[model samples]
Target: KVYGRCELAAAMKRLGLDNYRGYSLGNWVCAAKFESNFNTHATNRNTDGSTDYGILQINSRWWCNDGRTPGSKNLCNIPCSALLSSDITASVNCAKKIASGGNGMNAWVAWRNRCKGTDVHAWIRGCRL
Candidate 1:
């Protein structure tokens, strides 16, 4: 499922992303905009053989287990398939786990490159959150 910007922002807020780990809902929205464009089934393979999955692009190397990423910690303890579900619960849960880690929201490279230190609020400005 692909969500529009407003749709995603609303969903993220409902899923408890607002003010999560001290990052605003806009930060999460902006990261999702760059990470997967709000597409639930998105997936990308990394050069190191890890894979990024779902809207938040949770990584197989450290989060979900894809059964192919070597040395996967599977810290989220979920199958990578769950990240791609239209329901989004798994993805949101995993994302929260990631953001709660040492790196916090910086865990997403896309967030660092595009959302960080920028006007991320613009991503959800008119979302009526």
Candidate 2:
């Protein structure tokens, strides 16, 4: 499928995430598969605004104003205008920053455990950089 640059950038901005170099695309694809199944427009209403959204299922609303609305250009830190002009590296880098230590995969694991499961931090076991 041909992923549009605007769509991808909008999603990344909404998640306050970026792409990284060391992290393989396979890992990203894996993370996306398990999280929101690579659905950039995906949103889980079950957990209010703390759960998951977009390709990486980023809890970006906690970090930025983008969470309240979809595709709000004003909510983006880097703005979709600039983000769409950049490469995946920027998006991955942003993702890493949001993750804080590990990659988006770790964030996904954390979210599933902390927000969706009985045991808080249960996903810590799967955490790795």
Candidate 3:
């Protein structure tokens, strides 16, 4: 939700994820930029009628969902509404599970498309975290 890049880096560091299973902070930040433009209020309904939730754009097809909603998988066991908030604790927690689940940054399409390679130290360059 309008979070600064430095703040996000700090949060990731707090979570002990300076690099989660070889996925760097830049990978996470770049995904957030492309997926939601860093807006936690972001939500999109796909052509298939599935919706993506929050900054990481986690989909209802496999994450949080209401039983009646589009895909409604609810795999993360939280209400989809929870992901739309500015306090990202729940979102971050779920994202960690996803990354550690062996998906890495591949968990988000944006990462594969824009951040999978190239230099991204710029994302956390001066954060000093």
Candidate 4:
């Protein structure tokens, strides 16, 4: 499913992303917009032979095991395919795991480039908590 902005926001809220790990819901919303435009099945192959998967674009190189990325750590201990499901629960959980890491949301370059240190409230401005 390609999620509407508010729909994604609501889903994240239900999944408990609101201020999870000290990052606001706006931050997650903004990162998803930049990463995959809220496409559940989104995938991007990197120049380094890794692939990013799902809305949050969890990567094969370090987070999930695609069984193809060389030396992949699979730190999330999930199959890369799981992140692409229309049911976003797995993706949300995986994203939380990523955020818990030392780099936090900076693990996603999209967040750093577009959302870092910015007022992201607009991303969720119209959505009720």
Q: Between which residue pairs do clashes occur in model 2?
A: 18-91, 18-92, 18-93, 18-94, 18-95, 19-91, 19-92, 19-93, 20-92
Summarize candidate 1's per-residue lDDT along 1-129 as a digit string, tens digits. Answer: 888899888889998988888888889888988899888899998898998899898889888777897674888999999989778889998888888879998888999999899988888988878
Model 3 — which ten-residue stretch has the worst lDDT? 66-75
lDDT of 3 at 61: 77
lDDT of 3 by residue, 16-126 (tens): 666778777887778888888888879898776778888788877778774546544676888778889888777888888777776677878888889888577879888
lDDT computed for candidate 2: 0.43
Against the reference, the lDDT scores of all candidates come to 0.88, 0.43, 0.79, 0.90
What ranges in model 2 sit over 4 Å off?
1-21, 46-51, 67-93, 102-104, 110-129
* Every model's TM-score: 0.94, 0.44, 0.89, 0.94
Candidate order, lDDT descending: 4, 1, 3, 2
lDDT of 4 by residue, 69-119 (tens): 776588888998999998888899989998997998998899999999888
Any idea what lDDT model 1 has?
Answer: 0.88
Report how far off residue 92 is in candidate 4 (Å).
0.9
Each prediction's RMSD over C-alphas, in Å, is: 1.1, 10.0, 1.6, 1.1
lDDT of 4: 0.90
| Global Cα lDDT for candidate 3 | 0.79
